[PDB]
Amino acid sequence: ARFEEQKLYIGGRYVEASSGATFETINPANGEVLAKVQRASREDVERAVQSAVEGQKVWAAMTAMQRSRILRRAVDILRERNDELAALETLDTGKPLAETRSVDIVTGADVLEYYAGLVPAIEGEQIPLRETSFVYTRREPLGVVAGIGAWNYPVQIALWKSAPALAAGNAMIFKPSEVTPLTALKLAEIYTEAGVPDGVFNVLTGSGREVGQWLTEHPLIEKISFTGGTSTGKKVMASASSSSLKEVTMELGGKSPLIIFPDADLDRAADIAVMANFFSSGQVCTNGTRVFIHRSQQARFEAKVLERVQRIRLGDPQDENTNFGPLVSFPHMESVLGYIESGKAQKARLLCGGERVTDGAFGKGAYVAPTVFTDCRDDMTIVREEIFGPVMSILVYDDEDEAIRRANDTEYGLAAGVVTQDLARAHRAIHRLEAGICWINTWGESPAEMPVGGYKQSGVGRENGLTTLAHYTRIKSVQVELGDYASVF
Amino acid sequence: ARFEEQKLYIGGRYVEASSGATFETINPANGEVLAKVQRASREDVERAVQSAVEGQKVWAAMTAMQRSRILRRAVDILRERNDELAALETLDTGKPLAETRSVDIVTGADVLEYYAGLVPAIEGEQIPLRETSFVYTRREPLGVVAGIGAWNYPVQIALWKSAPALAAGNAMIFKPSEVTPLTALKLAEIYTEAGVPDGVFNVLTGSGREVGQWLTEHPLIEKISFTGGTSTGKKVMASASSSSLKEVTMELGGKSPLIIFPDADLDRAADIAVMANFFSSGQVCTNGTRVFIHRSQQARFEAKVLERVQRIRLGDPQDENTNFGPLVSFPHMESVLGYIESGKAQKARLLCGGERVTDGAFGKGAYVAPTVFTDCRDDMTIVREEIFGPVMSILVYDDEDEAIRRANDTEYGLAAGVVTQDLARAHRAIHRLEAGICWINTWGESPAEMPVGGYKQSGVGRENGLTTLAHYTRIKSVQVELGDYASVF
């Protein structure tokens, strides 16, 4: 009822889907139906893929600097529409305006900016073999690739995925989550306005079981990049493999440790603790959801953590003074409620919240109190499993080696971090932790330059940094024989 | 049996399997039983993993130059044992002595020697952020990895997969083909003698549906590297993915095009085409089994191909004089003979060969004659489908753009080559061919420095070159904060 019915974006304009079917997008701050959103048919996919083939041709026939200028011109617009975009993402996701205005488009574009400047730096190798022969390599685009996004940072992830793919000279078809489809359509508009050729960035709306699956199976898509949960990642990765051997990147979940050592400043430690857990209503995949403190310091540190959780400003995401909103959807609110009832039953001590909050307006939304449990153990459902909502488990320990031992004991391997003032301990410990994203006296900063991804079952491949751009090309080796050819026959 | 029963190799020695079962390996030249070989159990797979976990720790704790020296010592033993290992390879595969003595151990050891020099050159990055903070990255081992071998180049594949795996500080569990298990066990012996710690290279014998599967499923194995057919590679990759999101490299098959432009040296062209079809009796994955010839040279090209094929010395692979041997097995002979009958039924013109060679002793072995069809068309089964025996398909074309479009019109993408004396044409054509391994005026050479692998359904990732070494490490990113930390709560 609130916004007009959303169409598929294919070949540089909106087109009518050919399914007959729609879904609704719902503002989770207060249940308001934000839009009717068309669902792509299997033949819509065929059409988007044929569009991308003919478009990729156009874009890759440009010189590298012509592609860099078009991408930079898309970065200018994103800076220019920062606020109007952040307004939309907030209605779509329930995330506070104080974060969307300041992070989502700001880091989305930071990454696109970084890669736009690197287009001319994509190079191959030359290797001499003998006087009469040498080899050179070319790094070529994959062709049409496909991205499949999450609902927690919708426009940002849409940028972090398509920035490298387009910079590497690929056409991308993107599928936003059914939960949050709005700003990805806006990104498509913008890119077209930048001069990005028709077909180079198509968007298909719908569900993971339908349009997602049809994207992983399509014989003419050369790579799948996916962001989301581990159990889904497995199905997604198996589908791309068994259909046509696609190249893949997966950014998945984690249950990341944070080790406070006994020499840490505890004020620092608590700030890091609270920042690692409550930002975006605990809806960040890298969150430091397992907090280790020394036994000799659990009382003091539990003091400072409650002190700070007490003053989180829960409120309207629309409000400028809000720093904590609702969760992305109601379905997801009761998934989190289901872990908090799990923690309670398992004798885990509750230190604050745990209860859905409805006073005045709050009841028309999906609001959960920031929740903290303490005196936890390793076999607890809340300690072993990923929650994806504002729930912090706190664990006591007696020595360094034990803390590291326990930090590593997981199928997960996304992030990890340490709080100490000692040079030796800081490096020594971090070298021993099994995560791809490691922090020393900080948490959460993710620079365009820093490769990020998971160890173990949190990922395959990486995002950001120079490495990620390379992995959106394919290597062709060329051997040039300048002398005689010898045959045995 | 010609030899003693072949046992599993775990932890620097031979150990009894716990399956209660074996299989035979057979000499395809004469049907002699070479050995009985033990099948690994599920619990033997668990034993091999526990052994690799412990051994990898010891290997990783050495210096870079200590690992380098150990691997260079293994190279030295391989050069010394070249002729003996070549004689065993010839027994197990049927490949002529003239090939195993010059190619298999020479080039397998060339790659180990390459990576041994490169151990000290593996390095991370460092990226300043501001005065108060920087990042560094570590390239850490993956831990335990697994390789699954093919039967065309048994010891060479074992070396090409284990060399970068061990140079990068990992342990590998290797599963040789059931068809060809013998030389892989000898390579495990040599790594041990060289100084490689117990458990760093273990060998498990048995089948793909059983031991290949238990390897690709295991939660503690971090990466799978597999060489084999495209259909099986699809199953392997999907199992590696859906079980624990393992990293993967796939080297698969193809139907690789050779284009002979009308300005080519025709004798060079025919030398290349026969080398690209008939080396190792037509059982090389990169073979150029679609040969495009211009309409005006078809008759002259055919006479040149016929002349070379008539002087091929098919015989006993123990004779130094033989340059063309039996096929690897009797089942594989049957499949090839079926492709030959298909060619005939669909009315391609038989230029030469086209049957089993059975005169005298040859009737004991699995010998298929060097076979050339001509007047082929793109919809024929012999043209569409990988045969992996000695069958060349010659296809007529009229213009350059048509040859390249027909060359590229396949689900495969392993290799491609062009023959032309024109500078512009050579590079222009090669830049448009969609394959990872591209040759100008030559075929088949695969230098240690040159990364090799498939586009499309012919592979995922690469082997050889500087790049492949980087792909047996995982990136850890470490942000160091030296300043104040800010919290928004």
Added chain:
Amino acid sequence: ARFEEQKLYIGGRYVEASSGATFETINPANGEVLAKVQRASREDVERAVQSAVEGQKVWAAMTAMQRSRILRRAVDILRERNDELAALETLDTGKPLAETRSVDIVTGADVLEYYAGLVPAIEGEQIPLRETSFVYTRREPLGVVAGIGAWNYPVQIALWKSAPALAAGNAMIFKPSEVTPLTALKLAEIYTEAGVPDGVFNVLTGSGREVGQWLTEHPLIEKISFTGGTSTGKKVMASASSSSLKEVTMELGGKSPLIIFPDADLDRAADIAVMANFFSSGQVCTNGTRVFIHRSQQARFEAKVLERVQRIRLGDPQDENTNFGPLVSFPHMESVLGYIESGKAQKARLLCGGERVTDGAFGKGAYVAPTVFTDCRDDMTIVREEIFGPVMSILVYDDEDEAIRRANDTEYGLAAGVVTQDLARAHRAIHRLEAGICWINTWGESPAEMPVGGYKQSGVGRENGLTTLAHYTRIKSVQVELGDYASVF
């Protein structure tokens, strides 16, 4: 007095010199005094050094992306002002407007644009030694650097030097040629407008022997980058070295060979010969001034050269239809004509040109006719010595090995080139040519991605490409001991 008096540029504005001394800059087409220009004092050099030390701290304290955005903005302004700056370059140099509007500012800004995008890509290395020790490297700015410009491409050369220097976080003091000081001053206005901090790009006008030399001697300057003649470069590099051991870059002169092989299209070959000799009236350092023609092609080639030279449009460089202007000055013209008379005295055969053009208003300018000598020999002064005016020397050869030996028989080694259709010969001949800048079937194009500089006495170091950015940083190696320290004492 076409323009008002031109002042020193120091600290983000124009400042009065303290010398009491000025020079006149003149238009070479007509003798018109364009402007009075101030000469920097020795006190003014000091003032510019202190200004640069302070501005560099400000520029290096910014983030990498802060610096990128500022240089990208300078590029936008250069793009807008292309036609204006070209007009002033034409006034100052005599170059046709058809060249300055297309080449000079276009290719100068291309290099700044290239480097602007790479600012965030500059990284150190990280090397693990053992569990308890690792090394990291930093690539830190050099600090204050100086560039000394040549008169043939005044603003392009100011761009090619300042761009990597600023991108790598340095401040630069630039000294334009006394012959062409006008466009360097506008570049400094542009940098300031884009937001480059005060003192990061300072410009000092006056002589090489006074102000050029005070810069090369100053103990706070870390690197000198110079473009000009070989004999001057020896003096400059010698002074930079003996004063305070500076880093140096040197882009010097040449006598570059172009080999025309007997399979070339003679229209392509003659098009390449004339471009390689007569662009910017023969005042390009990389010019291909020794043109090797096979005995069998000599007559037909000379006819095709004579034909192009007869339709060269020598005239007023303000006329868009001019493609061959006057030389930069009358002194220079005098030198050139002495070379021509030497060619005549030494019995070389004049194909065409060989005289000053004095008819109509041309007597007011420094115009020399496009000149071609043929029947030349290797011991001729016109063949041995760099002329730097529009004078081609044609030399006959009989075999390839002879042509290559003769091409390499020089103390110079800036550029070289070959024209042939043959794949094998193109690469093999170019691999044997002792020059840093090599062209197959083309001449003169110099992409921002392509490192360029001399072998032998034609240079030290390179400009452009990835490599050059690296060479405006200094390496610092940091070893972190995290374990015990052992003394033998």
Added chain:
Amino acid sequence: ARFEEQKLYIGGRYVEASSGATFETINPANGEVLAKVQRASREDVERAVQSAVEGQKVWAAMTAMQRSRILRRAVDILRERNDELAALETLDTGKPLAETRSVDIVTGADVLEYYAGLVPAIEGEQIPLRETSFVYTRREPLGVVAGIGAWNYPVQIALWKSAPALAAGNAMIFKPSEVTPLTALKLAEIYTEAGVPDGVFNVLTGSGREVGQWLTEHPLIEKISFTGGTSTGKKVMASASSSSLKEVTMELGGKSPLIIFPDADLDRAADIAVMANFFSSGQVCTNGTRVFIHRSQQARFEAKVLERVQRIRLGDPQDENTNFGPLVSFPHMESVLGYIESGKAQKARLLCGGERVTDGAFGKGAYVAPTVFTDCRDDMTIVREEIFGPVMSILVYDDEDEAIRRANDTEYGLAAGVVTQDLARAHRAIHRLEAGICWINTWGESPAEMPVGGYKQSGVGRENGLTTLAHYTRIKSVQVELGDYASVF
């Protein structure tokens, strides 16, 4: 004389010099004439260059792995002869057998080993411009290069220079210090026994004023690599420049700061300080000769230094229990004693040593007792100038920002270090120190992987690491035009 007359080494064997003149080499421990040594003539220089030019061709014509194997064999030989080369180095330098057996040959061979593995990793670049054009680079050998060695580490410096030069495809002519000519000749024998072609490594003995000068001036030598004092480096670098514009590398002297912060453990800070001043009897270029201690820790730091200095085992370098021998020469001893009197005369407090040791046999040798001065001031001659003997100057500071400003206030910039247990301080301070070689909580280790050399007036270029090998090649860019060529004429 102890040994036979030493001859020039040219073309894989010893040859007679043609000067008619010798010099003597003296054992500094007892004053015995170890050997008469031939002075190379101007003409002997020409002979060595001509032999290098021919030998370089043969060496560069081998494959990368053939050169790798030959260099690795030279490593093997150096390992087996470690003890014998060590004994001869002790004779020539006076260094303790405890040092020469463990450091000099071990680490010189470590660097040779490192580069031997890297020969095959030297690659150029590939850059696509458009469909019709691309560029590739070649990294080619410089040709003939020269190394000029110092007397403090004669065989180690001979190997650190020749290793990357030979690894990159070059021949080197090497001139050892007149003070220490013996072990360089032995290295030339070992290279030839390893299979290095005749002329690839030639050795010329004699003075820098004469033979070093003849090498720096020779027009066929392409690069000079020099180790020694700053003032001599300035002359060598200027002569290399003005003669033929050679490439250069300079490793020169220093007055390197060691800053001990207040949290430092004083047992550790004192072990680092004595190892930083008295290893090699004070004769290491990177020595931490200015020791900054906080005012409030001065008293206690001084006690711990004296206690370690008192137990230094000065004695006969041929006795294994010696860990402190004579200086390299009597002239050098005389120079160190004049700095000692400068120190006294200028009223620095003598903490210990400060005279020559003349008891019994020592009076026959060149022994200066370990010396520490304290209460030193920044203007004192001992604090400003490089001494190159065993003289530590201790300096009080009061605040961090200050200690870092004092450390930096020098024209030198070779090494620096900090001792501190705090994380933020260790890294923040090192980042501000203007030195190429930086140590945290350690001193003196120089891994083969780690690029080392001087900031400011302490050097140009680097030795060791990946980057050094890169600087023993020249870049050639090759533009391949595959389409039409456009002329303006």
